[PDB]
Design a protein around this ligand. Structure first.
Ligand SMILES: [Mg+2]
Ligand SMILES: [Mg+2]
Ligand SMILES: [Mg+2]
Ligand SMILES: [Mg+2]
Lengths: 169, 168, 169, 168
């Protein structure tokens, strides 16, 4: 404990990058002709979700589910049916990617038209499970990050920018 | 709605048959040496579970989970099943779609083994080929209630399998 | 760890006592004329529930819900509506009775015709919250008990009798 | 089903108004000295939540829970609210029955304080007198979509409040 939080990725940059992802995702699914649904993973992705779905220019539905994070359980499942639909799993950050990996499996069992993942942050150096991530906002080093849905000691989860925690001696 | 309920499978037969299944399951897992866990599907299997686990002579844990076109997990397991022998316990299997998917979901967790044990089985109503390792009774497609199976929120607590008789 | 389990309350005695409770509960609600529902608290009461409902001679519905056991949360709620109905909360054992206490409050908010609790075992000496328990199978001293839904180290939960754990030196 | 959607409350107005609510809520709790937590009700409030919490200038935690004649808890809080200031965050309040009960349930947990903040309010549709401490917009009983509010699984992601126009 005993620390400080400084801006790592300012709000404007995050907003800009999200607008971009928005375009990319739209370009990618605009001609599918099938129902689409963005699936966020609570709690972490509520903010990134809120902002990302507004940038996606294709009629979709927004849903959430929460998984345990040694077995991976479903604490809260989807309300929507994804069978035959294009599904985009939306996450705040991917590091080890175990949980994500299993959630993807579980969902595919429901036979969606397609399955992809879009994360705001990516820590490639911390991967433990090879998992296909189709959209990334920022590839970052293994930094102690907070904000945009990411918390630390039940704090900072509501910050509008990605911050770096500095552990004072 | 206007109906009657008559005994189809009396309580004694059910108890006897369960004692048997009990032996079968015990014989089958007694030498595994791995942790075991019976997983019941709520609400339907609470009674069959309660009785079946008492007949299983191997140290196991008892857990439940409840499932919902897409098949969802309304309540998940509390236990981890990875590397453990898992026996899904159900009151009755007919179409077997839900069961089928629940089995898939669980296998993703990599248990040592996966099996299903149902009290009742209506083979004539299957829609999904699903492996059922233990069966108490194979029955015709009858309107059944009791032992966890209800009808209009009734009979779920009957100690025997009953047949519903619609009245015209 | 390192222990033994010996019979404290044999299966026959438990069966007999439950048949009795069965009669008592029936006598008590037989003339209500309102829908009835026994609500069990998972995991512990699945066995006591299974046996008790078979002794209750009044048409009822059986349901479950699971609560966290410092705030008391609802991990799994009822499927049935209890408003205007006679509700009997069914538990394997009551000791401190905090959780039970709160679950009772939560449910009353739904305005059931009536609310009662029926427990197999009762450890009066361990109460921390004064809570009304209308039916009791056995009042026991604060013994290390297992069986009939009560476990210890994920074991014995399936025993058909109440056992006493003996911690070998 | 055959319809159109036109802008009722443009995105800019909503952002502005939220910044204001932000100030109000901050002014109100800045000196509490107790832990604070905004509790959103899924699905509807995920967007309003996301934007509102960024305007609240006091260290808080963000949590959600989802509720269902009887009002049930489909998903409960992860946080404990006892002794903490709790702000229930909703997209819109009309009849307010569900909200009303959720408030009761939570108070049973003895939080330091309990308040509600809704983006939209349809006073004309109230059925249960429930205290709403913060409101973004008081609107007539219009067919609204956007900002978390959907219609036929659509528009939930619109950045503005829209009005649905049925076509005959
Ligand atoms: Mg995440
Ligand atoms: Mg079943
Ligand atoms: Mg209990
Ligand atoms: Mg709402």
């Amino acid at each position: 404990m005993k620390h400080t939080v400084e801006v790592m990725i300012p709000e404007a940059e995050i907003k800009a990058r999200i607008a971009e992802l928005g375009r990319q995702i739209t370009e990618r699914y605009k001609d599918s002709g099938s129902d689409m649904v963005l699936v966020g993973l609570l709690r972490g992705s509520f903010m990134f979700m809120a902002d990302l779905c507004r940038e996606v220019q294709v009629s979709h539905e927004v849903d959430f589910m929460t998984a345990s994070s040694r077995d991976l359980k479903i604490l809260k499942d989807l309300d929507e049916d994804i069978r035959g639909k294009d599904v985009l799993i939306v996450e705040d950050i991917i590091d080890s990617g175990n949980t994500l990996s299993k959630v993807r499996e579980i969902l595919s069992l429901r036979e969606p038209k397609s399955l992809a993942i879009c994360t705001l942050l990516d820590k490639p150096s911390r991967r433990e499970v090879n998992v296909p991530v189709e959209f990334i906002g920022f590839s970052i080093p293994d930094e102690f990050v907070v904000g945009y849905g990411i918390d630390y000691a039940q704090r900072y989860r509501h910050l509008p920018y990605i911050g770096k925690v500095i552990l004072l001696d």
